[PDB]
Amino acid sequence: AASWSHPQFEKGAETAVPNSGGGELFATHCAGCHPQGGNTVHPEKTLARARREANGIRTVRDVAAYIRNPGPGMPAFGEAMIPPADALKIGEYVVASFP
Ligand code: HEC
């Protein structure tokens, strides 16, 4: 934006980003408390499939919903921090990763 800079018709360059990967997003937002799918804050609440499913957290979209209003000691993630597409990726990684 110099004095001589011209108007543009082009728009939306800002949002032309790659889709982030689930593993990286997990490492960034979750692995601190859930390393290797465990739980360092509440030891009984691991991400092991049977345990997630005991509370009805069965699918990718169950994960992506759970993080919006989770249990004590876990922060809630709203949609500015973890947009819907990113929530799905994190759900995918949880389901693909922790038996
Ligand atoms: C620590 C500050 C946490 C961060 C960051 C994340 N989680 Fe978490 N998680 C944490 C606690 C203390 C608990 C137990 C809450 C309770 O009910 O007592 C959990 C639980 C989960 C679960 C399972 C819920 C259940 O079985 O009832 C899941 C599926 C889960 N957490 C996923 C998850 C994801 C995907 C995160 C990053 C986006 C994440 N957690 C962050 C502690 C913390």
Side-chain angles (χ1 to χ4, degrees):
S3 285
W4 61 76
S5 296
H6 301 86
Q8 311 153 188
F9 68 89
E10 40 299 72
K11 298 305 178 320
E14 298 76 18
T15 57
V17 299
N19 312 313
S20 15
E24 76 168 284
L25 289 162
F26 191 83
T28 300
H29 304 292
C30 321
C33 302
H34 296 291
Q36 292 161 336
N39 191 326
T40 66
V41 171
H42 190 348
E44 305 176 81
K45 289 281 194 162
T46 71
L47 304 193
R49 186 189 42 76
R51 298 319 306 145
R52 312 190 298 266
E53 300 199 19
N55 206 20
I57 306 155
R58 313 201 60 224
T59 64
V60 167
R61 294 171 167 88
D62 293 340
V63 182
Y66 178 78
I67 73 166
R68 308 303 191 192
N69 197 15
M74 179 170 160
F77 295 88
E79 269 206 3
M81 190 175 282
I82 305 191
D86 282 354
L88 288 182
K89 294 302 285 191
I90 296 165
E92 285 184 83
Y93 182 78
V94 168
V95 175
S97 296
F98 308 120

